[PDB]
Design a protein around this nucleic acid. Sequence first.
DNA 1: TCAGCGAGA
RNA 2: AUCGAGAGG
DNA 3: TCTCGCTGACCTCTCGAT
Lengths: 265, 159, 862, 171
Amino acid sequence: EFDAIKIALASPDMIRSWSFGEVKKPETINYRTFKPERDGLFCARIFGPVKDYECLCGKYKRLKHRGVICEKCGVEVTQTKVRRERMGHIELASPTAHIWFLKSLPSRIGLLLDMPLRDIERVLYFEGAEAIQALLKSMDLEQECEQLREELNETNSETKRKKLTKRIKLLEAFVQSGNKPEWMILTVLPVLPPDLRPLVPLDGGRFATSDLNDLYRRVINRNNRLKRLLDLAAPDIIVRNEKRMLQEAVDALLDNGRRGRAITG
Amino acid sequence: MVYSYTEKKRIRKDFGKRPQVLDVPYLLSIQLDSFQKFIEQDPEGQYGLEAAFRSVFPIQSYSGNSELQYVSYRLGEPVFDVQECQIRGVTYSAPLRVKLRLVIYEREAPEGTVKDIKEQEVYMGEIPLMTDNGTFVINGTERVIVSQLHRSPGVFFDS
Amino acid sequence: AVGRMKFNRSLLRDDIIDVMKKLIDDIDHLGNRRIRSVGEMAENQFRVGLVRVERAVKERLSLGDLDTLMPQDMINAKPISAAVKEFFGSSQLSQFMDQNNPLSEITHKRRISALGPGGLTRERAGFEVRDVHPTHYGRVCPIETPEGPNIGLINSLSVYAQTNEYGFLETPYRKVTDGVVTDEIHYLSAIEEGNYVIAQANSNLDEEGHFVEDLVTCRSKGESSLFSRDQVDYMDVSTQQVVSVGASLIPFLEHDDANRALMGANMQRQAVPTLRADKPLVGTGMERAVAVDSGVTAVAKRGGVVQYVDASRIVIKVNEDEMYPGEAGIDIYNLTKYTRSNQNTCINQMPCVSLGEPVERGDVLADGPSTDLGELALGQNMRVAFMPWNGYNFEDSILVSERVVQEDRFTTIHIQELACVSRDTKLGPEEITADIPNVGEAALSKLDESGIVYIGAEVTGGDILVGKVTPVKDSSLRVPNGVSGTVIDVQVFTRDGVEKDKRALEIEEMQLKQAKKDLSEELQILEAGLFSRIRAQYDELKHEFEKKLEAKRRKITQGDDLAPGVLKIVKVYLAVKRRIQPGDKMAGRHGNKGVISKINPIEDMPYDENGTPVDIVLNPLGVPSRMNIGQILETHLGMAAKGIGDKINAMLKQQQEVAKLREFIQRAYDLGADVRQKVDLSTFSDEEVMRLAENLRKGMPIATPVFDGAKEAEIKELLKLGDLPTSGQIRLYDGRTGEQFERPVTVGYMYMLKLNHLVDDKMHARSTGSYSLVTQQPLGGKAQFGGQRFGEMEVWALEAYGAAYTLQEMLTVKSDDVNGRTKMYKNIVDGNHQMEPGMPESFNVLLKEIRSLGINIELEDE
Amino acid sequence: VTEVEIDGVLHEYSTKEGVQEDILEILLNLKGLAVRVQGKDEVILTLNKSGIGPVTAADITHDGDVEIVKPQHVICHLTDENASISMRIKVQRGRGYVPASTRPIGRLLVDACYSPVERIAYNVEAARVEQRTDLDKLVIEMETNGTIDPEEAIRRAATILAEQLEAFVDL
DNA sequence: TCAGCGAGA
RNA sequence: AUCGAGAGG
DNA sequence: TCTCGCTGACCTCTCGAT
Ligand SMILES: [N]C1=NC(=O)[N-]2=C([N]1)N([C]1O[C]([C]OP([O])(=O)OP([O])(=O)OP([O])([O])=O)[C]([O])[C]1[O])[C]=[C]2
Ligand SMILES: [Zn+2]
């Protein structure tokens, strides 16, 4: 049926569209219970029921009960094959920078601007990341593209002409592709469906823990700490250090080891 | 040319030409020597559990004048021998019995003598024992810990 | 301390300054690397546990207390126990032992690894570390290394190699003073031997010890050059000083290339012990040392006269000089009987002594696996004919006579352990009783009243060994599939506090009563001598005996430390015999290997003029393509040895006076250009000579030390003494036609080994089964019953063929198309097969993973 | 020998007290047993012995039909006087190698090497009949276990050959 | 490890 | 499932 | 023009510990 594979940047509205539930605050399914924790990384409300065509309360038990939500259960009747499909998101307290665009071989985060990789890294490391988002939003593609085109037309050197035409090509790509700038800064972070990260049971009580689950849990821990320190006024230094920790956490989640030491459990 | 009763039953015809001046040593002598150095009593703190104890035995508070010491250590008889350790699926280990000592000095009076000395014997974990064949029995499975070839400590100059 | 010594020696001796001064002004060399054994690593782990305990003690005692601080509450044994348990069981160097044969255990225990914690990495390592170094001579075997990524990094200790106090490998050398070799031995490390010039072992010497040649080949400073007698400082102690234990077992090693010697040394370790251990006709003389030092053979601790002999146990009456004053004078050697191995093989000890036979210290009393009268016996001597036979030994293949299968020369016992574990569950859904729901009457009767199968019963696939039902679906332990065998042993484990069912009590008490009877008999055997001596403190002896019996009973009845959550564990041991079939890997000691392709009838095999057929037919084209001439030389020498044995057997068949046998055996032992061995039969008694001739009737064993083996002339002389052609080739006749083969064919006895690569363990075939969760793909193992990976290169092959539909069905219909798989199975079963491929689930997984990265990827309809 | 039943033995992979040889070795030694039966194919032999000393093929109870050609070779050994051995041996008649794997508790199946012929060698030499020198003589050399008569072996082989050839003789 | 690669200085 | 240690091709 | 990160380097089986 499909004829092409279209790839583009995802808007925060696009990420919220994918997600079925806006909750990721807890960490693990349970310490001793097979039932998924409510609003956790694994949850029946968000990602779907572990049980196949069943309700725990049992008010409606029939084939017609499919698609009907029990008041006590509050969970869909669908299978786990949709639990592989359902997605969630984490509402970040503060915007954060995507590690791919900031730390690529060409820094397209720095390529739209004029600052080098070191300057952007220093700005986003102090935290910070909202400053880069504001700089990207304040930039105008049309006016900057016209100025760069004029400068390339009145060019005296080959290297300067190459840099100007690279910048103009990037601006034209942003204009034509339909992806706005400042989307390199992520404010809504989607979470993978639960079945794609096994957390496989063992014969004993202990389960082998997938690395993605641990990384997500640590990122959510940092996000909750930032939410608390924003709800209650805190000194600027502590909040900045905590925001740096959150940025490092999301960077290790998206691509571990790109900048600094990788997270070791 | 056969003196042992086992070899006298059937003597192998030897075509070797070079006289043998040094007999082949014990094939597992390395494991036996290593674990014997590790286990056996060392009068000096050079090798083994003795040298291990002289490292972090003096654990105490900072300038508290009350330090924790010991006099010696002893390894007990294993509860089970190798065969029934393999049968039961349990580690073949010997309990470690260590006699520790504690000294109490006068508060803010370093010149004064030690107030009291308290010595007592304490059980400290299970140390697995190696059989006569140079192997270990861990959780009912017979195991071998091989030697490691690592760079000698010191200074070297390489490009 | 070794580090401080090395730091002082390197700088010829503020410490940081001296390094910079010499820097302004080869790591693989042995002097730069030292050996760390199990003792030092265990000490380091103890140090880690002890510093953790010290930190805990400091934290606890920072509060401070007057008379309330004691050694007990400060320390805790949990961290030390955890650290030592992790080291013994989870460390990289703590490895599951290779228990295929005594040689495998010896090699594993003498193994040296450059990897491990605080060491190199196989992928990061380069060619410099993996290559042989002039310091490897005598310390590390250059021949025996793994063939995979671990080449050069995993190494085996040499025969004569030691370690000094500082941990550096050293080798023995014969001190040379004033041009004459002196028997005194000095162990030299690499840096120490580099200064000196060392003569070679292959240096002729006179009676007084002087070098025969005016100029003697030597080495110095890592290079070998000719030297005069005066400059020589040291000499090699033996010709086996360089090779390891495994490599020294190869006869005629100097006639093979190092590649095939490596292959033979490795393949000697996968050899599976057979029903009867058969000594190697051609050997080196290291078999006895390997067998004794492996520990698989019972060795008399004290010399005495054998008092009791049995399959299960041996009793030695210690001599008067060897008894302790308090010792009764009885040594009991219980023998291992049909126990499982790490590699699922069998461990068996069979007595090699008779009642009343005198025994001295160090004598072998029982023969372990792959051992024959104290000699390592990894395989069977086989009569080999090097000739093509209708392409059944076409490409390195092997053709085997049916007489080999009939005589069970290569039949092996393999023991499989199966465990049934009952776990604690609320409401009691799981059952362990004999009565199970929906169980056949025959299957129920197969198990005992306790729910466990009887010892000695024959079990085939799909038969329950232990009865269990859980909710209640039958959770009974059963053999998985295909595997068949007999129940040789059953073990039931219960905790001290775990509730014991009466039927389970019956089984466990039967086992405990058998163990207690064995222990009581063993104790009474030793107590009988003391009681008889008392007849010539009876109450005290009786009290001591009763106390020992009570202690043994308590130890037997002591509950096992079961893991939490499980009540009882029942272990069932199954033993089956594997007979050779087409598909089984066979190999020798010279790097040659092959797979049996056909079991040929006895009459069809080529036969000699006397009518004796050959057992093995090997392609001669595999000999000159490779560089393993040692196999041909061993074949000729084995033919000569079997000829000598045949002459001895012929003189035994018709009654011959002992004088003739003594004369012939003395002539056979005296043969050789110049041999150090001097076997004198005049010393032996008539019964000793008769026993020796009985042992030699199947072939006289031959010892050929590596780099010192038998010359070709000696092999020809041995062939002459046995009335055999000196060329080693005889006229063979085709079994199917009776027509003589147009050319002479070399025929002899080569020591063949059966490797742990049986075809039944490797044959696998899957139709459909379990699929993975993250990707709906078939599993990836034979144990998991998974399909075969269709890698990218195979997709390239199908693309090159242009097989679009085959590739499409393998990508979708055979995997990742759940609806496609479900419809395809029905289509195939119904007989009208049509597929509708869809989107693989792995592509959807990829899309979800990419979307979770913040990138929007979608499926554009048009 | 096809089946062996020992009173105190449950399976092959075990040992019996007072016997130096394992049960598997005893089964191999019983496989290496040569007997002749004239009455019927199936016959049961019982072996009983007590006290120290090797157990040979003479120790099987005497049967008129069954003739043990070699009563000298040992089956097992008894080490102490108190021990005793009691086994029932089953002997059948057949041809070729029939493995035990191919088609109760305590009976031990044994691989049957039925064929009594160990080695065959034949040589052709010149023979002088009348004044003709073109004729030759065939000298067949046999090695057996003693179970079969060489002349009877020749007669049986020739009869088998003729029975096979009669198919080619007919159309 | 050990290369090779372009892009900042 | 993952990791470590091996082994075969 | 030259450092300076970033990139790259077939299939199968067995074992145990998490
Ligand atoms: N990708 C890949 N990486 C590897 O490391 N190895 C592979 N394949 N093989 C495969 O196996 C054939 C040689 O094995 P071998 O033992 O039969 O050696 P050989 O010379 O051909 O014959 P022989 O052993 O008798 O001397 C070779 O082509 C290949 O397909 C072996 C190692
Ligand atoms: Zn309901």
